[PDB]
Write a structure and sequence with these properties.
heterodimer, A: 225 residues, mainly beta, Immunoglobulin-like, 2 domains, seven-stranded mixed β-sheet, five-stranded antiparallel β-sheet, B: 213 residues, four-stranded antiparallel β-sheet, 2 helices, 5% helix
Chain lengths: 225, 213
């Protein structure tokens, strides 16, 4: 079965360099052009370049002549891409993909196999653990039937953080939102709705984990007095 | 470069119906256009190449037509798993380029949002910050406006919104708006309002609280 394993996320301070891998398995590596595609959030896929491992030849989008260097190691079935002079602009997902036809002269074809993507985050921001504040309803507002409780997770970097409600035992009626950038730092929230009989008669606790700063906290949600 | 424009960007539909989306090239690309399905937690799948050829292993409900300048993709009979993101890529010349994408959404019953507003946590107050959070939950369609009012005045600065994608259980969206103030600015006012205007109601859904309450 044909795979392309890409390397893990990288963080990089502006102006820096970064090099990523793409380990190809289960077909003749030297016979197919490996392509690199870039994807920034809401902005569509751009083609960067491609390398022909069978003769180590390479073709680059004019837009990346400066930016990218592609290389292959054929003993290892791997292709590499190295991006230099980093910028916020270069913060994106980068994919390698296999041309769907073998052969050297089918340079511009489509791709049948993609890798899961490598994430490049380019930031001057420092590693910060998040503040975890609990959201409890407006003083004395157990409304009609249900009750929504929340969790605010503020000013951390880098991504990600992972949240659960009551150690993960409580899991429907949860909405966890995608993080957003405030200045340098990420912030995200999560809601959980549950029947007004469940609470404040039982304990509901928010569980945030930020692996990047080795933080694990639990805010129990307390009624407001 | 050749420029792809895919239309529509968005599209809602239901299991069983047909849809067909567009991709237009800025110049002639002979017959050479491919289509990719993009789905969270899975690698991009090739669906069609050269305008009309099925990729090995792709169901025959996917079909493609076009040549020169105008192409389509058609899904004959939408399957749950077909709700996804589709891109077109031209394979006629250097440099390869893509369209922007079409997002294919599962249509369901209009659903009014369940609003909730939350005052700053005391732990936040103590450290000098004050964030008021407002959860707008389980609504359809996706279009919504939220409005922060301080003591009656609409306040735009310091508001950060985030939307979830279409829910895997009931297909609804959910939102969270967080206006962030300095604790000093926070106490300078009394009335905090979150107003949500949504297709389901001619009048906005308002929720607020008074700082001393």
């Amino acid at each position: 079965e044909v795979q392309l394993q890409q390397s893990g996320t990288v963080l990089a301070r502006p102006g820096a360099s970064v090099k990523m891998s793409c380990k190809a398995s289960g077909y003749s590596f030297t016979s197919y052009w490996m392509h690199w595609v870039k994807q920034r959030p809401g902005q569509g896929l751009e083609w960067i370049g491609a390398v022909y491992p069978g003769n180590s030849d390479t073709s680059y989008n004019q837009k990346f002549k400066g930016k990218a260097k592609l290389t292959a190691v054929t003993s290892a079935s791997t292709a590499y891409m190295e991006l230099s002079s980093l910028t916020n602009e270069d913060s994106a997902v980068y994919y390698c993909s296999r041309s769907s036809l073998d052969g050297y002269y089918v340079k511009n074809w489509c791709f049948d196999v993609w890798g899961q993507g490598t994430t490049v985050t380019v930031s001057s921001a420092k590693t910060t653990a998040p503040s975890v504040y609990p959201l409890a309803p407006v003083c004395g507002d157990t409304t009609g039937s249900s009750v929504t409780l929340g969790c605010l997770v503020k000013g951390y970097f880098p991504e990600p953080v992972t949240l659960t409600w009551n150690s993960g035992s409580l899991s429907s009626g949860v909405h966890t939102f995608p993080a957003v950038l405030q200045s340098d730092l990420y912030t995200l929230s999560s809601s959980v709705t549950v029947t007004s009989s469940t609470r404040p008669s039982q304990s509901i606790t928010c569980n945030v984990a930020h692996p990047a700063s080795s933080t694990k906290v639990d805010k129990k949600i307390e009624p407001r007095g | 470069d050749i420029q792809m424009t895919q239309s529509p960007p968005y599209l809602a539909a239901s299991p069983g119906e047909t849809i067909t989306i567009n991709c237009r090239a800025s110049k002639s690309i002979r017959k050479y256009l491919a289509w990719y399905q993009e789905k969270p937690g899975k690698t991009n799948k090739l669906l069609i190449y050269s305008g009309s050829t099925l990729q090995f292993g792709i169901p025959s409900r996917f079909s493609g037509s076009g040549s020169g300048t105008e192409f389509t993709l058609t899904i004959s009979s939408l399957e749950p798993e077909d709700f996804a993101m589709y891109y077109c890529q031209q394979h006629n010349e250097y440099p390869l380029t893509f369209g922007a994408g079409t997002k294919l959404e599962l249509k369901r019953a209009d659903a009014a949002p369940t609003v909730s507003i939350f005052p700053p946590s005391s732990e936040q107050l103590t450290s000098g910050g004050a964030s008021v959070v407002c959860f707008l939950n389980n609504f359809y369609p996706k279009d919504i406006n939220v409005k922060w009012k301080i003591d009656g005045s609409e306040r735009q600065n310091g508001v950060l919104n985030s939307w979830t994608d279409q829910d895997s259980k009931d297909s609804t969206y959910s939102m969270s708006s967080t206006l962030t103030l300095t604790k000093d600015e926070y106490e300078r006012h009394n009335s905090y309002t979150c107003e949500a205007t949504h297709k389901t109601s001619t009048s906005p859904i308002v929720k607020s609280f008074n700082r001393n309450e």
